[PDB]
Amino acid sequence: KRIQSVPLVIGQFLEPIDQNTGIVSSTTGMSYVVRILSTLDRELLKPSMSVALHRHSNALVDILPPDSDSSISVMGENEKPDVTYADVGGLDMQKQEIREAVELPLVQPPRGVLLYGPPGTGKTMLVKAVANSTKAAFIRVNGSEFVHKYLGEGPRMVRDV
Amino acid sequence: MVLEATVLVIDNSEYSRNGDFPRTRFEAQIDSVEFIFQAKRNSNPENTVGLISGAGANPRVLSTFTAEFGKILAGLHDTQIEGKLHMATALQIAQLTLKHRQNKVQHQRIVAFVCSPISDSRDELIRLAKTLKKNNVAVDIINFGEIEQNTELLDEFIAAVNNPQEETSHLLTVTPGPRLLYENIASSPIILEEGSS
Amino acid sequence: DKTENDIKALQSIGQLIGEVMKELSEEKYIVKASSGPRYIVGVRNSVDRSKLKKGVRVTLDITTLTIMRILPRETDPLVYNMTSFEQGEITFDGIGGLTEQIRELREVIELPLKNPEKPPKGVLLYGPPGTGKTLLAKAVAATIGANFIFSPASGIVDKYIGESARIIREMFAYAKEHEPCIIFMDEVDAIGGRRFSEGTSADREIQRTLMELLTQMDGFDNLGQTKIIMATNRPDTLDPALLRPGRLDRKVEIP
Amino acid sequence: HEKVTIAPLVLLSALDHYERTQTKENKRCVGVILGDANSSTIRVTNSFALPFEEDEKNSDVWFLDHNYIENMNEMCKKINAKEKLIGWYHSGPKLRASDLKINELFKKYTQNNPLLLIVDVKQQGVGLPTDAYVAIEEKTFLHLPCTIEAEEAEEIGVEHLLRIRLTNQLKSLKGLQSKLKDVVEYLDKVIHTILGKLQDVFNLNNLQKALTVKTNDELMVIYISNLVRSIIAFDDLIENKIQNKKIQEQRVKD
Amino acid sequence: TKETVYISSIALLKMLKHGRAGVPMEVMGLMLGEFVDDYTVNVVDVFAMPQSGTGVSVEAVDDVFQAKMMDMLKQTGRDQMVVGWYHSHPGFGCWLSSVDVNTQKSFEQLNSRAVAVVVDPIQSVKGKVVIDAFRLIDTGALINIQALIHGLNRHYYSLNIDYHKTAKETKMLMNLHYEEKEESNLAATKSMVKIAEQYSKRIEEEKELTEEELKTRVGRQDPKKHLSETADETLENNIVSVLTA
Amino acid sequence: TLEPSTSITLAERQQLAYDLSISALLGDKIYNFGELLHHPIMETIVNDSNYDWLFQLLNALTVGDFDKFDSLIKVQISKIPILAQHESFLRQKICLMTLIETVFVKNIRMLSFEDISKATHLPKDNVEHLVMRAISLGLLKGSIDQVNELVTISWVQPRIISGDQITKMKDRLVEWNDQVEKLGKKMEAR
């Protein structure tokens, strides 16, 4: 049990090679066959994970529940957005549409919805207004955000985000 | 001269509360101490002294073992002014004090103001005197008492401590009048003359 | 002794930097190296596991790889990559005769600060530059008191195969902290404009960059005390969506 | 109130002090304790022998120097700023009126009322060989309960040492042991009102009501899984192991 | 060559507790013990050099502080030989410094021999202890022999660690974990309050299982795993809930 | 506060302690009952004059007969007549405390109400107040069954004496204790 320890390197799990073998991702861009917890197996082992990595033993120390904001470059979050909807007047059909599209199916089917037009026109305002009411964890993203030389990270949180 | 540890026994007490010559007895005590201790550290550097409370209802060390000013530092603050005899205890502490005296080959010495009516028992007094002589302490006393404190323990005691004088005990019983303690005791082999044994 | 200090200080060694991405445990931290990728790290000492918080710049260790100090923060060449000049050299008057704009812009730029009763989104010069035109910005910048922050374009994405928002948001955030600030983006057709076939020359860089502003503009980011002057010599050279309110509330002619 | 962390480092060392000092029960090896005392849980970082003299032939006669602590803390501070004086220790096992004198000396040197520490240098009785007192005042002094922390770095070396329920009961006697005696002690010691204060909460027993029996109600469901606890045991292994055996025992081709 | 280092775990934990905060820098200072014939390296004690803001350095060693303490220690009756160096080398299997060597080296001059005690305060945390002692040079050896006379001795070169305490502290140390009676049954009689949850817990334990079992028809959320695990924990408390009566 | 120190005079001693013993009356109280009377205010206070009363009041603090005292009453005590209520307050509480302290020992509570409340030998319709009032006596807990004429009671009654449950104490508490060890044999051990 005691062989675990802290001053590690972050990474992302990819896929197990077998039980007690898998490939992970390094934040540094390495990805390799490593060893893992005897703790997790297939059950508690999880399909991809932010993962605690031994350095030179270089193996998986643990999965990581948390975080967010490596690069990528983070996530847009206004938690409880400041916009009420109908604040660009007359969007009902579209307002209902989004509502039809998401707000309702949030309760009960599309996985994704496309807003089309000039944004921030009230168009982007649609989102926040919706996102406001929705009472779910909001994440804004900019395609204009993913532009870090570190072509190694990139999608990494784009997944995890 | 002196290589020995000393203790300063101060009663701040029915006498010290009360000026025996400027500005108070308790104050008259003070600069006389430094005067003494100066000559003590002039006797030799490294000559160490204690400072305790024989005053008040609590016996305790005021300045511990040292060798310079840190005493003069320590003595700087007050005491219970009207306080009462811990002397025996205070002495018995001053004894144990000297039992911890630092970097021995320092003989044991004690210097004692008498600002108190001096309540103790002769045997206890002499048991001290014994214990001193046993421990081999140098004992000199500062006493201006009512009458004085004398024809009493203090007189037996310096004797009772003493096979050799300053290896055990010398006495001076401080007189009244324009008698400056440091000026007075400048005479007595509490200081100067022959200083240690 | 001075030299000796220098002599001495040669023992004083450099210590890595990073922002806390987050706090895993009180000690355990998720910190992307300011030089590189994420790392699981602990606290060190003189460290306030209280103060340690998301996005907080910290000094980091080369070997221990943990916090070597907790830090304030700011980035970028403020006067270079960012260009930081306070206000402007000569006031609106010296170039007077553009007075229409002179007033017209001031009211829609300077004042909306001092009268809480939208704030303006954006203002775009056009016409020939420097007519007082480029100078307007300084003359503009002069009148408000905000820090004029000049933006040339391509440096914001030279190559430099990335650096977009990080650039612009430092331009935003520094200003956002340093506000009042004037943001003046020079003649923005390389990092502005609707592009071409809208194919990829690295245009995808531009669109992003083109959008990074759009994101700050059509996005909730406001001009708090920091304002943005857009510059072009020809207006029609810009993204239609850029001209939009929510991004630009003024299209500034200079006849 | 401020009831405190305990440092094994201290504890051990204090005993080596006791050891080192060659202290006997005639004496109690004494010294500084270290920590930071502000919180409603004080922490004990460290602690230090105060070279000392103790005489109970004449109680108030005993010797100690502060100038240790003087020299001590300086280094200690220089060693660590968090070392700030919280109090002090001694051997013990038990108190002596000499303490109070000793006690208030530290009050000079302490933020709050400083802390006594009893040790049992013979570690005899129980959880703790230890008490820690703080003067209150009619004097008061008081023991708030305390315990060890991690100190895992310690616990790790500690891990190199040693090597569910029952004990919980095992104190069943202890207080109850002395208690009635403690009465009969004071009873026939003087042969106080506090004792009668202790009394009324005795009736706080024979209390039991049908309310009691509601336990089993709860205890009923408590047992539901007892099958299920082992039901999966009741299911899997030797099924598969036999299979695995049936695999393995039939493996046996050539 | 095969040499015996010994610690009173006090000095150990002292180092540790001091080294535990030591990061970034190595904790530095005296080490107190002796040499009994050869092979015998005891440490009764140790202590901090007060921090050197410049970091660990041979200059940073102050012999006043020791003297100060050692006096107060000699006053304590606390007295030993300075037996070598001890430091906290976070994340370091490593080796300490040629300096640290030179540190000890110029120092071990002060002895027949000394130590430089590695501690990785980081990887000491495992629950085992990471730790080491260099002293790099030999007589011949346990008598190694050549590299000194043939010169150029640069190596890791550990010594061989041990330590000893007593059953005395051990008991008291096992005394870690009025007390328990106040502390146990009866302090955790706190059990019946949540019986509805203690139901509900068990009641939720329920659903998780058919679900889990269902899969019985690799990769997982195993049909058999949590099932037991899920409930079984409850049992002890679920059990002892009775006892106090 | 004076308890350690401050030598005084008797005219200082009693007369204060008088006024004290008096202020027991112009207390009266959360009773009290028994008190500092233990401490050397007594002989000292009583003696005589109103101290007789003040002593006889301590008697009424036990006896609680009006006309063992409402006999005695002169102006000063009748000056506050409210003791005539306070002695009822007493008698109840005085009756109660021992009625409380002992009479049920057997997990004492009920005392409910009336004859038990008339066992205070203060009558039933005043019971309908005095007994009815509880912390409307400043003190009592519990409640009323009007119908069944049952006091519900709880604590807010302190008390004293010695010698008795002393032995009982350890007995049961060593009883399970010993017996436990049977169960208390192997469990976490084994």
Swiss-Prot record, chain B:
Cysteine pairs bridged by disulfides in the record: none
GO cellular component terms, semicolon-separated: cytosol; nucleus; proteasome complex; proteasome regulatory particle, base subcomplex
Disruption outcome: Cells are viable.
GO terms for biological process, alphabetical: proteasome assembly; proteasome-mediated ubiquitin-dependent protein catabolic process; ubiquitin-dependent protein catabolic process
Keywords attached to this entry: Proteasome, Ubl conjugation
Domain VWFA: 5-190
Membrane spanning residue stretches: none
GO terms for MF: K48-linked polyubiquitin modification-dependent protein binding; polyubiquitin modification-dependent protein binding
Keyword Electron transport annotated: no
Modification(s) after translation: Ubiquitinated, leading to its degradation. Ubiquitination is promoted by HUL5.
Record's miscellaneous remark: Present with 17200 molecules/cell in log phase SD medium.
Functional description taken from the UniProt entry: Multiubiquitin binding protein.
Record note on quaternary structure: The 26S proteasome is composed of a core protease, known as the 20S proteasome, capped at one or both ends by the 19S regulatory complex (RC). The RC is composed of at least 18 different subunits in two subcomplexes, the base and the lid, which form the portions proximal and distal to the 20S proteolytic core, respectively.
Family: Belongs to the proteasome subunit S5A family.
Name of the protein this chain belongs to: 26S proteasome regulatory subunit RPN10
Species for this entry: Saccharomyces cerevisiae (strain ATCC 204508 / S288c)
Gene from which the chain derives: RPN10
Stretch of the intact protein here: 1 to 197 of 268
From Swiss-Prot, chain C:
Keywords, comma-separated and alphabetical: Acetylation, ATP-binding, Nucleotide-binding, Proteasome
Spans traversing the lipid bilayer: none
Source organism superkingdom: Eukaryota
GO cellular component: nucleus; proteasome complex; proteasome regulatory particle, base subcomplex
Residues reported in the UniProt entry to bind ATP: 127-134
Family to which this protein belongs: Belongs to the AAA ATPase family.
Protein name: 26S proteasome subunit RPT4
Gene: RPT4
Residues of the full protein shown: 89 to 350 of 437
From Swiss-Prot, chain D:
Additional observations: Present with 19800 molecules/cell in log phase SD medium.
Cysteines engaged in disulfide bonds, as pairs: none
One BP annotation, GO: ubiquitin-dependent protein catabolic process
Sample GO molecular function, one term: metallopeptidase activity
GN (gene name): RPN8
The protein's name: 26S proteasome regulatory subunit RPN8
UniProt xrefs under InterPro entries: EIF3F/CSN6-like_C, JAMM/MPN+_dom, MPN, MPN_RPN7_8
Pfam families: JAB (PF01398), MitMem_reg (PF13012)
Protein family (similarity comment): Belongs to the peptidase M67A family.
One GO CC term, this protein: proteasome complex
Keyword Acetylation: yes
Key word rRNA-binding present: no
Annotated MPN domain residues: 4-137
Domain of life: Eukaryota
Post-translational modification: N-acetylated by NAT1.
Record's function text: Acts as a regulatory subunit of the 26S proteasome which is involved in the ATP-dependent degradation of ubiquitinated proteins.
Keyword annotations: Acetylation, Phosphoprotein, Proteasome
UniProtKB/Swiss-Prot annotation, chain E:
Key word Oxidoreductase present: no
Post-translational modification: N-acetylated by NAT3.
SMART domains, per database record: JAB_MPN (SM00232)
Residues noted as binding Zn(2+) in the record, renumbered to the chain: 87, 89, 100
Alphabetical list of Pfam families matching this protein: JAB, RPN11_C
Enzyme Commission identifier(s): 3.4.19.12
Molecular function GO labels: cysteine-type deubiquitinase activity; metal ion binding; metal-dependent deubiquitinase activity; metallopeptidase activity; proteasome binding
Domain MPN: from-to ranges: 5-140
Catalytic activity: Thiol-dependent hydrolysis of ester, thioester, amide, peptide and isopeptide bonds formed by the C-terminal Gly of ubiquitin (a 76-residue protein attached to proteins as an intracellular targeting signal)
Residue pairs linked by disulfide bridges in the UniProt entry: none
Cellular component GO terms, alphabetical: cytosol; mitochondrion; nucleus; proteasome complex; proteasome regulatory particle, lid subcomplex; proteasome storage granule
UniProtKB keywords: Acetylation, Hydrolase, Metal-binding, Metalloprotease, Protease, Proteasome, Thiol protease, Ubl conjugation pathway, Zinc
GO biological process: mitochondrial fission; peroxisome fission; proteasome assembly; proteasome storage granule assembly; proteasome-mediated ubiquitin-dependent protein catabolic process; protein deubiquitination
Catalytic EC class: hydrolase
Record remark: domains: The JAMM motif is required for the deubiquitination and degradation of ubiquitinated substrates.
Any further remark recorded for this protein: Present with 16400 molecules/cell in log phase SD medium.
Family in the record: Belongs to the peptidase M67A family.
Name of the molecule in the record: Ubiquitin carboxyl-terminal hydrolase RPN11
Organism encoding this protein: Saccharomyces cerevisiae (strain ATCC 204508 / S288c) (Baker's yeast)
Protein's gene: RPN11
